[PDB]
Design a binder for this molecule. Structure first.
Ligand SMILES: CCNC(=O)[C@H]1O[C@@H](n2cnc3c(N)nc(I)nc32)[C@H](O)[C@@H]1O
Length: 215
């Protein structure tokens, strides 16, 4: 269940981290963008597949902060990833050209263009966990501290229905992303042009918690 990252991915992670150290908040923009892409994918599949949305009838992005556990969660009800996809799509990668472009650039816009924004999560996380459920497979968990990664069948079973949850164990210097005021402001900014509703789990005054629409 243990795997090593492809050399190119190791270099890419380092380039991204060294290039965006000044604007770490971009990680949320990238995770939201990826969630949107995943939702576009299942929507495209639903055009031809009548049972496509059976595992979860909604098309949304939901963000939750768990200050107590030092976790930030970004969940989408997109197409999800099979076990094989978790291993291949996150562990391997015009890569040589991009790597040269990044180096020749030192990148915010470039990263999104080449579709490697996911790795910016390491700008603010000591550990990145990806739980995913695809219609053609069972739920699995991918986890990595960037020095290796593992994939295991999720012992909780099918809790997502369909989709993916990106869970970030924040670095000590990234505790700000556990605060609602900050997350709501960033989510609002990065969700403006997303064509799917994005919600943040928040409080409202007793004190009641529920999903708050951000776009
Ligand atoms: C880390 C660089 N590679 C990726 O981010 C890829 O992993 C997969 N990925 C990342 N976030 C995802 C996400 N939220 N949903 C789905 I479906 N796939 C995702 C896609 O293939 C991305 O291009």
């Amino acid at each position: 269940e243990k795997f090593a990252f492809q050399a190119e991915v190791n270099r890419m992670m380092k380039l991204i981290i060294n290039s965006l150290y000044k604007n770490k908040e971009i990680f949320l923009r990238e995770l939201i963008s990826n969630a949107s892409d995943a939702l576009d994918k299942i929507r495209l599949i639903s055009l031809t597949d009548e049972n496509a949305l059976a595992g979860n009838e909604e098309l949304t992005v939901k963000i939750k902060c768990d200050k107590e556990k030092n976790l930030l969660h970004v969940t989408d009800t997109g197409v999800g990833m099979t076990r094989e996809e978790l291993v291949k799509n996150l562990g391997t990668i015009g890569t040589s050209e991009f790597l040269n472009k990044m180096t020749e650039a030192q990148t915010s816009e470039l990263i999104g263009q080449f579709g490697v924004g996911f790795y910016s999560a390491f700008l603010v996380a000591d550990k990145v966990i990806v739980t995913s459920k695809h219609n053609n497979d069972t739920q699995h968990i991918w986890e990595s501290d960037s020095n290796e990664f593992s994939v295991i069948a999720d012992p909780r079973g099918n809790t997502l229905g369909r989709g993916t949850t990106i869970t970030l164990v924040l670095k000590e210097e990234a505790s700000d992303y556990l605060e609602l005021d900050t997350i709501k402001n960033l989510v609002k900014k990065y969700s403006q042009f997303i064509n799917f509703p994005i919600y943040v789990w928040s409080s409202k005054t007793k004190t009641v918690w529920d999903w708050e629409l951000m776009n």
